[PDB]
Design a protein around this ligand. Structure first.
Ligand SMILES: Cc1ccc(NC(=O)c2ccc(CN3CCN(C)CC3)cc2)cc1Nc1nccc(-c2cccnc2)n1
Ligand SMILES: [Cl-]
Ligand SMILES: [Cl-]
Ligand SMILES: [Cl-]
Length: 306
C-alpha cells in the first residue's frame, strides 16, 4: 500500500470541491505518463464574479486500468484531507460526477523547479545581483528561500502524517514571486522513460533519492522523506544536476550506499546547507533532523545573510 500512516479509504471527499466539468476548456499537456496526464485549462465561473482563470487539471488516459482509477480518487481524497496550504500546490476543485475523475489545481507560472534551475544555471549569481535586476537572475538568496519553503511544506505534510515518497526538484513547482509549491506528478510522469527512475523488482523507483530503508526494506516514514529532501538540496545547490553524477544505479551503487558513501557538497552549496544534507543522509533514521528542525535551521541562515 502507498499510504504509510493515513487511510484514504476513511477520508471523506468534501463536496465543496465539486466543479462542473463543462466549465473547463482543456489546453496544452503539462506532463503525461503511461496512464495519466496534467493539462492546462481555463475554468469559467470558478471565481465568484465570473472571471476566467487558468488552472491545471489531472486526469487519466484511456490506457488506465482499475488500479489507476482508484489511485486518482485516493489522491483527490488526500489533497482534500490536507486542505489549503501555501507551500503545497493549491487544490481548487474536482469533477467526480458525470464522467471520469478530474482534479483541478492552481497553475504555476514558471513550471517545475528542476527545469527552472537548468534554465537559470548559466546566469546564476551567488551574491548581490541593481541595474541588472530586470534580468531576474537566479541568486543564492533564491536557493535558500526555495530550501526553506520546501522544508516548511514538508513539515506540514509530516504534521498531517503524510509521506511524499518522491520528493525531488522535478516534483516542486514554481509560481510568481519565487514561491515554490510541493506537488506530485505521480501517474502524470513518464517514469518508464525517465532515467531518474530505475528498474527495481517489478517497479520503477527514484532510487538516487531514496533512503536505504526505503530501497532495501520498502519502509517509508517521516525520516525517509528527510533523506530525499537532502538529495533535493544537492539538486538545488548544484543548479539542477542529477545526483551521484556518472554513477549508474547498479550493485556497486547499492553497496556504496550501504557502506556509507555520500555525495560531496555541490559547487554552490553554503557549508551550513551541506551540513543539513549530511545529517539528512544519516544511515540511522533517528539521527536525521526533522523537517521542523530543518525549517528553524534555514530560517536562522536566512536572517544571518541579511
Ligand atoms: C492538477 C494536479 C492534480 C493533483 C496533484 N497532486 C499533488 O500535487 C499531490 C501532492 C502530494 C500528495 C500526497 N501524496 C501522499 C502519498 N504519497 C505516496 C504521494 C503523495 C498528493 C498529491 C497536483 C496537480 N497539479 C499539477 N501537477 C503537476 C504539474 C502541475 C503544473 C505544471 C506546470 C504548471 N502548473 C502546474 N500541476
Ligand atoms: Cl477516472
Ligand atoms: Cl501518505
Ligand atoms: Cl564536510
Amino acid at each position: 500500500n502507498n499510504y504509510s500512516y493515513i487511510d484514504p479509504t476513511q477520508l471523506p471527499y468534501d463536496h465543496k470541491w465539486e466543479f462542473p466539468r463543462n466549465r473547463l476548456s482543456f489546453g496544452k499537456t503539462l506532463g503525461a505518463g503511461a496512464f495519466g496526464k496534467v493539462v492546462e485549462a481555463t475554468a469559467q465561473g470558478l471565481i465568484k464574479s465570473d472571471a476566467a482563470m487558468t488552472v491545471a487539471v489531472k486526469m487519466l488516459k484511456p490506457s488506465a486500468h482499475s488500479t489507476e482509477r482508484e489511485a486518482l480518487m485516493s489522491e483527490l481524497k488526500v489533497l482534500s484531507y490536507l486542505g489549503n496550504h501555501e507551500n503545497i500546490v493549491n487544490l481548487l476543485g474536482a469533477c467526480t460526477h458525470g464522467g471520469p475523475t478530474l482534479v483541478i489545481t492552481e497553475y504555476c507560472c514558471y513550471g517545475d523547479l528542476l527545469n527552472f534551475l537548468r534554465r537559470k544555471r548559466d546566469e546564476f549569481v551567488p551574491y548581490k545581483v541593481p541595474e541588472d535586476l530586470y534580468k531576474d537572475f537566479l541568486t543564492l538568496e533564491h536557493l535558500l528561500s526555495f530550501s526553506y519553503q520546501v522544508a516548511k511544506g514538508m513539515a506540514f505534510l509530516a504534521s498531517k502524517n503524510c509521506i511524499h515518497r518522491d520528493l525531488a526538484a522535478r516534483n516542486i513547482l514554481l509560481t510568481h514571486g519565487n514561491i515554490t509549491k510541493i506537488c506530485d506528478f505521480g501517474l502524470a510522469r513518464d517514469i518508464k522513460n525517465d532515467s531518474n527512475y530505475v528498474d527495481k523488482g517489478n517497479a520503477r523507483l527514484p532510487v538516487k533519492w531514496m533512503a536505504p530503508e526505503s530501497i532495501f526494506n520498502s519502509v517509508y516514514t517521516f525520516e525517509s522523506d528527510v533523506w530525499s529532501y537532502g538529495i533535493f538540496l544537492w539538486e538545488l545547490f548544484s543548479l539542477g544536476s542529477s545526483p551521484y553524477p556518472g554513477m549508474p544505479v547498479d550493485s556497486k551503487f547499492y553497496k556504496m550506499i550501504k557502506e556509507g558513501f555520500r555525495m560531496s557538497s555541490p559547487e554552490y552549496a553554503p557549508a551550513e546547507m551541506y551540513d543539513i544534507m549530511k545529517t539528512c543522509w544519516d544511515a540511522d533514521p533517528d539521527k536525521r533532523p526533522t523537517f521542523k528542525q530543518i525549517v528553524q535551521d534555514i530560517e536562522k541562515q536566512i536572517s544571518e545573510s541579511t
